[PDB]
Amino acid sequence: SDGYTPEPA
Amino acid sequence: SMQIFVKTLTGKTITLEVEPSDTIENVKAKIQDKEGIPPDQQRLIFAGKQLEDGRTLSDYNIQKESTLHLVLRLRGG
Amino acid sequence: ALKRIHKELNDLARDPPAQCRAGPVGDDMFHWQATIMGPNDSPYQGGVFFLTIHFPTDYPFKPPKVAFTTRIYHPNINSNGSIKLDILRSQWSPALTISKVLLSICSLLCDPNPDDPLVPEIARIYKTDREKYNRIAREWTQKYAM
Amino acid sequence: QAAADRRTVEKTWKLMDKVVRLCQNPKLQLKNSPPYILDILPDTYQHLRLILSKYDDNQKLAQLSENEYFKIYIDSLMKKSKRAIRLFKEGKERMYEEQSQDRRNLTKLSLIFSHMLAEIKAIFPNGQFQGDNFRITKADAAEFWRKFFGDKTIVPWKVFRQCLHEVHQISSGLEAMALKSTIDLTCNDYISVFEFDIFTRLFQPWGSILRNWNFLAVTHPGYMAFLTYDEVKARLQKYSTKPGSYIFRLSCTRLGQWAIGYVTGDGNILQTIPHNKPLFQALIDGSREGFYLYPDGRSYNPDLTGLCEPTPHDHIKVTQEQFELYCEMGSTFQLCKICAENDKDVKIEPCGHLMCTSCLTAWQESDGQGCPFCRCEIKGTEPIIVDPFD
Ligand SMILES: [Ca+2]
Ligand SMILES: [Zn+2]
Ligand SMILES: [Zn+2]
C-alpha cells in the first residue's frame, strides 16, 4: 500500500 | 523510391513512401509521425517474422506495395 | 465483450489474415480455435499449428487465454501447450485483437527468449547447439504439425 | 555553472554519502515513508552511476559535462548536500526533536531530494539524456513552452517569469515570488520542463492557470506547501475532534497529482488522490457530500462553484478522408476501438490517442497502465466530442 484510499463517495 | 502499406494496431491501413535502402528504424520513424506510437513500442511483422532495427527493407525482400503488420512490443519468457 | 468479439469476428471475415485463422467453436463466442502457419525459412516451415482460445468475461480488459494444442519445440512454449509471453499477462493491452495476438505469437517462434525460458532444457540446446535445436524443431514440425 | 566532469560528480557522491551517514543516526528514528531520505539518496547515487555508464568514452563525457540541465543538477545536488550537512552541525541535539525547526528543514530537504530524483529520472531515462524530447501533458501548456523555449530542458526563473507574464499577467512582484515557490519544486532558481509539466497538470486549465493557482493555493486555507503524507496526518491530528477537517497538497509519489487529507466520522485521518481529475471538482463534490467541510480546521469553506468554466471540449471534425477510410472497413472514426460500442469521448495526454471514458476507466480499474495503443504513461486526459462526418 501507499497509504492512499479511494475517494470518499 | 516506392510505397508500402502498414496494418496498424486497429486494423487501419496507412501508406508509407519509402525506398529499398530504408532501415526498419526509418520505417518505424515514419509510422511514429502518422500514428503517434514510439519506435521502441513498435514490432513490425512480415511473413510471420519480426523485422529488426539494423536491417533494411531490401534485406528483408520487402517490395512495392508489400504490407507490414504492426503489433506491440513483446518478449517471450 | 460481446460487441467487441463480434467486431473482431466480422473484421476477420472481411479482411482475412494470411498467416493465421481463427473463429468461434460452435455457438460459444468466448471459445475460439485458431491456426498459425509456421513461418517460411525456419524450422517450423510447412507446419500448421492449432491453438485454443478463451475470452474472459471482462475481455478486452483482461487477456485472452491462449494455448497450443499442436506440439511445438520452443524455449517459451511447453508440452502443455502453455505460452509464456508478456502480452498474454503483464504487458497485455486492451487494443490487441485476437488476430494481432496470433501474429505476435507467430513472431515469437523465431524470436524466443532462452535467457528466461519456460522450458530450460530446450533453452540450453538453443544457446549451445543451434543446428541441433533446428534439427529437432524440424523433426517435431514434420511429425506433429504436418 | 561548473562543468560536471566525472570528478565533480564523484565529489557529490561523497557529500551524499555523508548526508546518508548523518541520517542513519538511530536517534532520528525516521519513518519509512515517502519521502524517505535513506531511499532517495542511495537511489540518486545509483541513477548518477547509470548516467555515467551510458556516457563512457572521453567524447561522451565532455558532452555530458556541458549539458545545461546536468550542470545545474549536479551543482544543486552539491549545494543541497552541504546544506543538509550544515543542518546537522548547527542543529545539534535539535535534530532528535521531531517538532524542532531543524527537523522540519530536513523534511523539506528530503522533499526536494525526492523531487530532484523524479526529475533526473524523467530527464535521463535509463541514464540517457532525453530532456529535449520530454512531452508536456497539457496541450496548451506544451505549446507555450515550445513557442518561448523550443526544446530546452531548463530555463532561469527570471526568463521563465518574463515569458509567462507575456501570456498570463503576473499582478505584482509579491505574486511572482509566491508563484516561484510553488513551481520551483527543486528550489534551484531554475524552471525545468519537468517542473513546468507538474505545475500545469496541478493547476489546469492553462487558459486561467494563474487564476486557478490563486483560488486553489494562494487564497485557500486548505493548501499546504511542501508537506508530506506524515506531516498531513500529524497536522490534522489537531482536528481529530472535528470531522470534515481537510487539507490538500502535492502528492510526493505521484508528481503532478493532488493528495487530499480529511478527518472522517469518526476521528480517523484518510488521504486520497483524485487521479488525473481536476481538484476544483473534487473539492466541490467533497464539500457537497460533507467530507471536505473545514479547510485546515477552519469554520468557513470557500465555494469554488463556477470558478472554472470548462472551455467546452474542442470538437474534432471527422474529415472526409477518414470517413471513407473507416467506411472501407465497415466502421467509423468516431467509434471507440476498445469496446466497439461507445464513441470516442476522451483524449489521452500527452500521446493524443482517443477512446471512451468508460473503457479508460475500466482499463485503469483493472490495474492496467499506459495508453492501450502506444503504452505511453497517461499523465492527463481531456474530454472531447467527435463530430461524425455524417
Ligand atoms: Ca527548479
Ligand atoms: Zn470504449
Ligand atoms: Zn497513446
Q: How far apart are the C-alpha atoms of D333 and D322, rounded to whole Å?
A: 7
Provide the CATH number for the domain around residue C74. Answer: 3.10.110.10
Whether omega before C75 lies within 30 degrees of 0, making that bond cis, reads no
Domains in chain D: ranges and CATH = 1-130 (1.20.930.20), 131-219 (1.10.238.10), 220-303 (3.30.505.10), 304-390 (3.30.40.10)
Chain C touches chain A, with at least 3 Cβ pairs below 8 Å, answer no
Quick check: D271 and A3 CB within 8 A? yes
Neighbours of D241 (CB within 10 A): 11
Radius of gyration of chain B (CA): 11
Which H or E element spans position D156?
A: strand D154-156
Only one residue has cell 517450423, namely C44
| Structure-block grid coordinates of residue D35 | 519521502
Chain B touches chain A, with at least 3 Cβ pairs below 8 Å, answer no
Backbone angles phi, psi at D249, to 5 degrees: -165, 170
Surface of C (34-93) touching B: CB under 8 A: 36-40, 42, 75-76, 84-87, 91, 93
Q: How many distinct structural domains can be found in chain B?
A: 1
Task: Give B4's strand partners.
Answer: B16
- Give the closest residue to C60 by CA, choosing from C6, C127, C132: C6
CA atoms within 13 A on the CB side of D18: 18
Given a contact cutoff of 8 angstroms between Cβ atoms, the answer to whether C141 and C47 are in contact is: yes
Gap from CA of D185 to ligand 1 centroid (Å): 5
Quick check: A8 and D259 CB within 8 A? no
Chain D touches chain C, with at least 3 Cβ pairs below 8 Å, answer yes
- CB proximity list for C43: less than 8 A, separation 6 or greater: C73, C133, C134, C135, C137, C138, C141
Task: Give A4's strand partners.
Answer: D271
Quick check: C91 and B75 CB within 8 A? yes
Q: How far apart are the C-alpha atoms of D95 and D84, rounded to whole Å?
A: 11
Of D326, D373, D376, the CB nearest to B9: D373
- CB proximity list for D328: less than 8 A, separation 6 or greater: none
Only one residue has cell 556541458, namely D66
Q: How far apart are the C-alpha atoms of D124 and D103, rounded to whole Å?
A: 31
Question: What is the domain range of residue C127?
Answer: 1-146
Task: Give B16's strand partners.
Answer: B4
Quick check: D329 and B11 CB within 8 A? yes
Instruction: Give partners of A (≥3 CB pairs < 8 A).
Output: D
Q: Tell me how close the Cα of D273 comes to any Cα of chain A, in angstroms.
A: 7
Gap from CA of D362 to ligand 2 centroid (Å): 9
Give the number of whichever ligand sits closest to the CA of residue D378. 3
Percent helix / strand / coil, chain C, rounded to 5: 35, 20, 40
- Pairing between β-strand B42-46 and β-strand B67-72 as defined by DSSP bridges: antiparallel
Question: What is the domain range of residue B8?
Answer: 1-77
Given a contact cutoff of 8 angstroms between Cβ atoms, the answer to whether C76 and C118 are in contact is: yes
Of D329, D330, D368, the CB nearest to C94: D368
Is residue B11 within 8 angstroms of chain D, CB to CB? Answer: yes
* CB-CB neighbors (< 8 A) of D271 in chain A: 3-5
Q: How many distinct structural domains can be found in chain C?
A: 1
Spell out which residues have Cβ within 5 A of ligand 3, the ion. Answer: D 351, 353, 371, 373-374, 376
Only one residue has cell 501507499, namely A2
| Structure-block grid coordinates of residue D314 | 474542442
SS3 D116: helix
Given a contact cutoff of 8 angstroms between Cβ atoms, the answer to whether D240 and D267 are in contact is: yes
- Give the closest residue to D72 by CA, choosing from D196, D195, D252, D192: D192
Provide the CATH number for the domain around residue B8. Answer: 3.10.20.90
Looking at residue D343, the DSSP 8-state letter turns out to be B
* CB-CB neighbors (< 8 A) of B10 in chain C: 95
Is residue C96 within 8 angstroms of chain B, CB to CB? Answer: yes
Q: Helices (DSSP H) in D329-386: which residue ranges?
A: 357-365
Neighbours of B72 (CB within 10 A): 23
Given a contact cutoff of 8 angstroms between Cβ atoms, the answer to whether D122 and D134 are in contact is: yes
SS (H, E, C) chain B: CEEEEEECCCCCEEEEEECCCCEHHHHHHHHHHHHCCCHHHEEEEECCEECCCCCECCCCCCCCCCEEEEEECCCEC
Is residue B47 within 8 angstroms of chain C, CB to CB? Answer: yes
Of C19, C85, C107, the CB nearest to B50: C107
| Structure-block grid coordinates of residue D201 | 497538470
